[PDB]
Amino acid sequence: MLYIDEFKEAIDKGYILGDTVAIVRKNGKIFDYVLPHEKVRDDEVVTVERVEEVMVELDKLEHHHHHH
């Protein structure tokens, strides 16, 4: 699974430019981003997604515990 830190860094460093991005999902979960010209295998499903929507989906894997 892809996590938010890597995704945000790829945006900050200019690998993921713009408002939509190619994504591969497995079982509905995001497993990687795919950059222009990168190759995928036949069993991979590549969709174009909103960068903001990806950021919400990746938040589902973050820790939110806020009691101490």
Author numbering: 1 to 68
Give verbatim excerpts from the published study on this entry:
Work describing the contribution of bacteriophages to the emergence and diversification of the M1T1 GAS clone revealed that each prophage contains a conserved open reading frame (ORF) of ~60aa named paratox (prx). prx is always located adjacent to a toxin within the prophage, and GAS prophages that lack a toxin also lack prx. In our efforts to study the regulation of natural competence in Streptococcus spp. by ComRS based quorum sensing, we discovered that prx genes contain a perfect CIN-box within their promoter region for recognition by the SigX core-RNA-polymerase complex, and that transcription of prx is induced by XIP. Additionally, we found that Prx binds ComR directly and inhibits activation by XIP both in vitro and in vivo. Taken together we conclude that the conserved prophage protein paratox acts as an inhibitor of new DNA acquisition by pyogenic, bovis and suis streptococci.
Additionally, an X-ray crystal structure of Prx reveals a novel protein fold with only distant structural homologues, which suggests a unique molecular mechanism of ComR-XIP inhibition. Prx crystallized as a dimer in the asymmetric unit. The dimer interface consists of residues from β-strands β1, β3 and the loop region between β2 and β3, which allows the N and C terminal α-helices to be positioned on the same face of the complex. As calculated by MOLEonline/2.531, the pore or cavity sizes are 380Å3 and 993Å3. Although analysis by SEC indicates a possible dimer, analysis with PISA32 gives a complex significance score of 0.1, which suggests a high probability that dimerization is a crystal packing artifact. As demonstrated by analytical ultracentrifugation (AUC), Prx is a monomer (8.39 kDa) in the buffer conditions used in our biochemical experiments. A surface composed of one face of α1 (D5, L8, and E9) and α2 (M55, V46) also cluster into a conserved patch, and both surfaces tend toward an electronegative electrostatic potential. The observed Prx dimer appears superficially similar to a Bateman fold, with each Prx monomer as the individual CBS (cystathionine β-synthase) domain37 as shown in an alignment with human AMP-activated kinase.
